[PDB]
């Protein structure tokens, strides 16, 4: 019924870090179209005093993934990580940018 508040399209990596650092909550995130790899997508998340970047990988079947679990759409990848840690290093759960 309403558009997703996490799609920022084509913004530079540095721009995403800029906006996210201003966020008050860990897990604040946005999906941006990648700069190192055009056509691809990147996930930027605020965590502590930093902004971490995750590359959205793709396979031959068009599925999206960050680690091992594969998703059929960015939408599902995003929702899954609202309850499950987006990272295997630290426990980080996606929260909408405010």
């Amino acid at each position: 019924m309403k558009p997703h508040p996490w799609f920022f399209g084509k913004i530079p990596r540095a721009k995403a870090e800029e906006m996210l650092s201003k966020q008050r909550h860990d897990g604040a995130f946005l999906i941006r179209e990648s700069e190192s790899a055009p056509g691809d997508f990147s996930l930027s998340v605020k965590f502590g005093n930093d902004v971490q970047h995750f590359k959205v990988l793709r396979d031959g079947a068009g599925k999206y993934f960050l680690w091992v679990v594969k998703f059929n759409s960015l939408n599902e990848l995003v929702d899954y990580h609202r309850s499950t840690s987006v990272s295997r290093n630290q426990q980080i759960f996606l929260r909408d940018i405010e």
Binding site: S42, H53, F54, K55, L57, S87, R88
Partner: peptide, 6 residues
Amino acid sequence: KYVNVP
């Protein structure tokens, strides 16, 4: 470089 792909 990314968290999931150093």
